[PDB]
Amino acid sequence: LVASSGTLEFITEGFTWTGVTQNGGSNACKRGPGSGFFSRLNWLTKSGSTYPVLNVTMPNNDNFDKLYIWGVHHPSTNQEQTSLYVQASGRVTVSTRRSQQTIIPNIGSRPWVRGLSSRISIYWTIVKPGDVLVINSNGNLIAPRGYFKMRTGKSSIMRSDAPID
Amino acid sequence: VTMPNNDNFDKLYIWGVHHPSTNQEQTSLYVQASGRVTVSTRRSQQTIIPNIGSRPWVRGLSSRISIYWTIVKPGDVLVINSNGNLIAPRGYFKMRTGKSSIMRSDAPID
Amino acid sequence: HRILDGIDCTLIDALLGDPHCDVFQNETWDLFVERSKAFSNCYPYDVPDYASLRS
């Protein structure tokens, strides 16, 4: 989808996420002398000892298609879910006026990849002009920090190992 | 329920899974707060879990319903057991074999 | 060919029981024409794999 358009225009929208600690990260992924996290995503954790139901609205009043990237966190065990979220069983639901997609978080053990034993599933949702994006979840929700423009062109992708001259 | 197929043609049943907007709509329409729809046959098995979530304002309402079908062969028996968010079919359709298709168009008919 | 005119309903709207397609009761055809100005004025639905059930 992005290789057909060929752009990385990350327009930072005015997302409103209240009652939730933002900019969460880990010790394995570092940015400089300190720790780091994803720059295009926002890892949502608990805010103290209270994690309420999140409700956002993203209207599309432009003349181009929007592409949002949201993730579902998969902890390694039940101890990681209770330490990052208040509710032990979350559910991520991202729907629009023409589509509806719900991804259930799956608690399970993962192999040792880059020191960590946890992963995150990635699912996308394309918003049409005139649609309103409603993202409501009760746990394991990763919030997007922007979107991309779905341009129409003759672009593609190609795996290669040759140098550029 | 049990739906035997003692005919000589394929059957097509249409069943839905209701998706309420919140937990208050589930308890007001159903007794159990967590349902599960399971429609299986002798050769296939499909289970759709109801997903409680908020929907955008479409035609005044903020709830939707997922649609999944199940084709019943002659000789099979359709068993539909569920504990909530179940939409029951009132009939079926005959799966005829022909050269028909669909076409999106805006031209008038003369 | 027996051409059917889906003015107020699509093919999925006639299969689910939309009240705007009451004249298509037990109606057979050869080609269904879906208009671009078609809309739903009932309980909203979602069809995962929309090209699977319509074909």
Closest-CA distance, B4 to chain C, in angstroms, reads: 22
Flag if C3 and B104 touch (Cβ within 8 Å): no
Residues 6+ apart with CB under 8 A from A155: A3, A4, A5, A6
Measured between alpha carbons, how far is B100 from C55 in angstroms, rounded to an integer? 10
Measured between alpha carbons, how far is A2 from A105 in angstroms, rounded to an integer? 26
Q: Tokens standing for B7?
A: 């005919």
Measured between alpha carbons, how far is A7 from A148 in angstroms, rounded to an integer? 8
Instruction: Give the B-side interface with A, CB within 8 Å.
Output: 19, 49, 51-58, 64, 66
Distances (CA, A) of B6 to B10, B42, B75, B76, B78: 10, 14, 6, 8, 12
Instruction: State which H helix or E strand residue B7 sits in.
Output: none
Q: Chain B residues with CB inside 8 Å of A136's CB?
A: 53-54
Burial class (CB in 10 A: 0-12, 13-18, 19+), A28: exposed
C2 → chain B, closest CA residue: B100
Which method was used? cryo-EM
Quick check: B38 and B77 in contact, CB under 8 A? no
Radius of gyration of chain B measured on its C-alpha atoms? 18
Closest-CA distance, B18 to chain A, in angstroms, reads: 13
Quick check: C29 and C4 in contact, CB under 8 A? yes
Instruction: Tell me which chains share at least 3 CB pairs under 8 Å with chain A.
Output: B
Chain-centroid distance, C-alpha B10: 17
Flag if B109 and C16 touch (Cβ within 8 Å): no
User: Strands of C31-34's sheet, edge to edge?
Assistant: B101-104, C31-34, C3-6
Residues 6+ apart with CB under 8 A from B5: B11, B72, B73, B74, B75, B76, B77, B78
Measured between alpha carbons, how far is A102 from B19 in angstroms, rounded to an integer? 11
Residues 6+ apart with CB under 8 A from B94: B9, B10, B11, B12
- Looking at chain A, which runs of residues are DSSP E strands? 26-31, 34-36, 41-43, 54-59, 66-74, 92-95, 100-103, 119-127, 132-137, 141-144, 148-149
Residue extents of the structural domains in chain A: 1-162
Which residue of B64, B65, B101 is in closest CB contact with C31? B101
Long-range contacts of C12-15 (CB under 8 A, 24+ apart): C12/B67, C12/C45, C12/C47, C12/C50, C12/C53, C12/C54, C13/C38, C13/C40, C15/B14, C15/B93, C15/C53
| Nearest partner of A5 among A126, A119, A91, A137, judged by Cα | A126
**For this experimental structure, what is the resolution in angstroms?**
3.7
Burial class (CB in 10 A: 0-12, 13-18, 19+), A85: buried
Residues 6+ apart with CB under 8 A from C4: C24, C27, C29, C30, C31, C32, C33
| Nearest partner of A134 among A34, A15, A24, A42, judged by Cα | A15
Q: Which 3 state secondary structure label does DSSP give B28?
A: helix
Q: Tokens standing for A71?
A: 């993730």
Measured between alpha carbons, how far is C52 from C55 in angstroms, rounded to an integer? 6
Q: Tokens standing for A96?
A: 């629009």
Burial class (CB in 10 A: 0-12, 13-18, 19+), A66: buried
Q: Tokens standing for A97?
A: 């006026």
Q: Chain B residues with CB inside 8 Å of A105's CB?
A: none
Quick check: A84 and A158 in contact, CB under 8 A? no
Measured between alpha carbons, how far is B51 from B35 in angstroms, rounded to an integer? 10
| Nearest partner of A5 among A165, A163, A164, A147, judged by Cα | A147
Instruction: State which H helix or E strand residue B25 sits in.
Output: helix B23-29
Q: Tokens standing for A64?
A: 């181009």
Closest-CA distance, B89 to chain C, in angstroms, reads: 10
Estimate the share of chain A in helix, then strand, then coil, as percent rounded to the nearest 5: 5, 40, 55
Q: Tokens standing for B75?
A: 């000789």
Could you write out the DSSP letters of every residue in C22-36? Answer: GGGTT---SEEEE-T
Instruction: Tell me which chains share at least 3 CB pairs under 8 Å with chain C.
Output: B
Q: Tokens standing for A4?
A: 């057909």
Flag if C34 and B105 touch (Cβ within 8 Å): yes
Q: List alpha helices for A48-89, DSSP H.
A: 78-84
Measured between alpha carbons, how far is B95 from B70 in angstroms, rounded to an integer? 12
